[PDB]
Design a protein around this ligand. Structure first.
Ligand SMILES: O=C(O)c1ccc(C(=O)OCCO)cc1
Length: 261
């Protein structure tokens, strides 16, 4: 596997706050089609790595999703967290901006002054996001089936029919979400997907912000997010158990998965 990076994973190493690689970051000088961006990247991966673009929810900014940046980059990914052109943008707009940020990461991979010059395999990308940004991530996956993974959190869209999604998709959900209730959003969305590897992970007692920066389940959520991206963006079957398993954890009130190998 030309995409495998880093040491063989363990539960402990995936539950830790940081993976094996050293992380640095920079601010995007001139955002190409979105509001603002921070790029997180590993300084010492042994090869090119995939890129992941992450979008907040309605009214929210990079701080709500920031924690994914170092958590994912330290395991071997270039991660861009964005602010949208407006905090009031809707999911379809969020998806356009998410993909524009991926495009600019790819541009910077070819830009000799960039710290990520030659660090990105631009053919291997993923999408994540909170709430309307999670709906935007699903729209992004629907419109761009060459994306290798999606892992939205507490998603919402005006439609729950994402039968168009063929991208391996992990849905983080929050049991007590009153903004995007699981029964009208995350779960109908999950059930709609028929052609992909997919997973549903609902955090026991979680509010709408249960997968945001500062959540109290970073060990489990971080392990699952990293394992999903490693398994499907890197084709890295060393992560197949971590990606596909029921964690059989008390922090999970609802677990579902299908077509996972
Ligand atoms: O009313 C809704 O259905 C609805 C309301 C808000 C959101 C959202 O993205 O903002 C959540 C906080 O960032 C999504 C769905």
């Amino acid at each position: 596997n030309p995409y495998a990076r880093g040491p063989n994973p363990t539960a402990a190493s995936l539950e830790a706050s940081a993976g094996p690689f050293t992380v640095r970051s920079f601010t995007v000088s001139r955002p190409s089609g979105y509001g603002a961006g921070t790029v997180y990247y590993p300084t010492n991966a042994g090869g090119t790595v995939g890129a992941i673009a992450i979008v907040p929810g309605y009214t929210a900014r990079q701080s709500s999703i920031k924690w994914w940046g170092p958590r994912l980059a330290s395991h071997g990914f270039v991660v861009i967290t964005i602010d949208t052109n407006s905090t009031l943008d809707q999911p379809s707009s969020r998806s356009s901006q998410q993909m524009a940020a991926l495009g600019q990461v790819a541009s910077l991979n070819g830009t000799s002054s960039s710290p990520i010059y030659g660090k990105v395999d631009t053919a291997r990308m993923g999408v994540m996001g909170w709430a309307m940004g999670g709906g935007g991530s699903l729209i992004s996956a629907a419109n761009n089936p060459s994306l290798k993974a999606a892992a939205p959190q507490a998603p919402w869209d005006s439609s729950t029919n994402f039968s168009s999604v063929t991208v391996p998709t992990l849905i983080f959900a929050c049991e007590n979400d009153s903004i995007a209730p699981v029964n009208s959003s995350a779960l109908p969305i999950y059930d709609s997907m028929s052609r992909n590897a997919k997973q549903f992970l609902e955090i026991n007692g979680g509010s709408h912000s249960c997968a945001n920066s500062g959540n109290s389940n970073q060990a489990l959520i971080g392990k699952k997010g990293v394992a999903w991206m490693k398994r499907f963006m890197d084709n890295d079957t060393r992560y197949s158990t971590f990606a596909c398993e029921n964690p059989n954890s008390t922090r999970v009130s609802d677990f579902r998965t299908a077509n996972c190998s």
